[PDB]
């Protein structure tokens with residue numbers, strides 16, 4: 001399977017600029033490209049990507065998305081002087097032309113096609129194109145908002161034609177609406193377009209009625225256009241994550257795309273003068289991370305906007321860091337989305353309830369200057385994953401996993417058995433030595449990121465893992481338990497949150513436990529994913545653990561969702577996760593190690609519908625927990 005990350009960039013795309021006074025376009029400058037590539041170099045990220053050369057898009061490639069009349073017109077701009085270039089530009093809204101912009105527009109588009117080919121040919125796993133001019137405002141016969149040709153639209157149309165793809169997802173996280181992409185695919189159910197964007201009740205450029213949440217697509221495309229308008233500025237990390245957990249991700253995992261393309265404008269970041277939002281550069285590590293289990297990791301990230309040179313470089317690095325599989329930064333201070341964002345989210349979920357199973361329960365009453373801290377260092381672990389199979393069993397491990405007891409650790413095991421345990425089963429005592437050794441190599445280390453240990457006795461293993469973690473000290477521990485019965489886990493001090501997926505319906509009592517009893521049958525997969533995206537991840541992100549403890553008891557239908565969970569759960573605690581598997585199951589063990597190690601997750605297939613019984617259970621959990629954990633909210637709360 002595919003390995004690295006493509007980086008596509010050429011200096012030539014910085015060789016056009018604005019040649020006259022125009023306050024509407026002053027902000028789009030060649031330095032955006034130079035600063036972003038130079039920040040990737042500074043952080044050692046460009047050196048770790050496969051450089052793929054740019055090329056020109058061909059005439060027939062441009063005609064996939066644009067009219068002969070418009071291409072013929074743009075083709076004449078290289079021969080124009082400044083007066084003619086100014087006259088030509090004024091025919092369009094917020095765009096300038098330059099003798100070299102037609103050349104550069106061909107390169108930005110070809111650069112995007114190069115990335116698609118590298119990913120679809122399995123030459124790389126994923127990649128990013130750093131291009132100018134941007135694309136997503138560009139239309140069939142018009143330049144618009146700095147865009148000449150619609151780079152990302154090309155990518156989807158090209159991938160449809162040349163790879164016979166039937167489902168492509170486009171995520172536009174630029175702060176502006178990509179109306180050029182919306183128009184291109186508005187009737188096409190094979191391309192799912194998602195956009196959030198500063199809107200302010202249509203007072204913000206481009207000032208379009210059809211940028212609102214009620215534009216869902218047309219004809220056979222109904223439901224495959226998703227607009228989330230931001231009606232106030234200052235949106236934060238919590239607003240962006242709420243948008244992902246409660247709108248985009250549920251639909252994207254149900255759609256099950258074969259390719260993901262990101263219209264990656266970083267004018268949605270803190271400090272940007274166009275966006276005026278407040279999200280930290282670190283959030284793009286998580287927006288990237290949360291999408292990577294789709295389409296077997298096949299993701300093409302295409303630069304659009306972003307005008308604060310500092311804000312821009314940091315966000316580009318956080319994105320490539322994530323494409324490279326480096327550990328995600330911890331996001332602190334998360335909570336409820338603001339009221340305007342909850343209104344936008346609840347309105348889009350309601351209008352989309354006719355088209356997506358994650359929202360269908362909503363349709364019937366029966367079912368209800370600017371500064372900020374520099375991002376910290378993200379170093380990939382020497383060995384990413386450590387595994388301790390049962391004694392004897394050697395396994396075929398990925399190149400970045402490794403088998404594991406020191407004299408010091410042996411003394412600690414004896415101390416613990418002497419005070420707290422009596423037990424002499426010499427292998428469930430080797431268990432404890434392995435748990436303590438692997439945890440020490442996770443926390444007080446830097447060399448290892450996560451690990452998986454097979455165990456016999458859950459209660460002493462869990463207790464030893466949990467207690468050793470707490471005194472390390474890891475401030476908070478998220479525990480994810482698949483199984484029944486009660487663990488030696490205390491949730492009465494705030495330092496532990498326990499998620500439990502079980503078979504017997506348990507009444508929860510306090511707001512530090514989430515207990516999900518999902519029914520038996522075919523819909524267990526969709527129900528689990530709905531719970532993961534809409535309940536588990538919101539709470540876990542708000543909790544912000546320093547360690548994730550996963551626990552599976554011996555008794556297998558979740559063996560189809562476990563990979564997605566352990567991939568997504570690595571967005572917490574910088575990927576520091578210890579998974580305890582009770583008993584040897586080679587498939588589950590190999591899958592756990594696969595996902596812990598950063599390998600691609602196999603797709604689920606287009607998702608069925610969850611049972612209404614399960615959706616009712618999940619929304620009762622949300623109602624019970626969302627006052628404590630506001631990131632769970634996907635509606636505006638009632639005022640007194």
Ligand SMILES: CN1CCN(Cc2ccc(C(=O)NO)cc2)CC1
Nearest residue numbers: 024094145176205265267304305306
């Ligand atoms: C406040 N207004 C808003 C719009 N603006 C023109 C404009 C700027 C940036 C983009 C873009 O595409 N950014 O990524 C598009 C149009 C002029 C003043």
Ligand SMILES: [K+]
Nearest residue numbers: 172174176196
């Ligand atoms: K957008």
Ligand SMILES: [K+]
Nearest residue numbers: 185188191224
């Ligand atoms: K569409």
Ligand SMILES: [Zn+2]
Nearest residue numbers: 174176265305
């Ligand atoms: Zn933009």
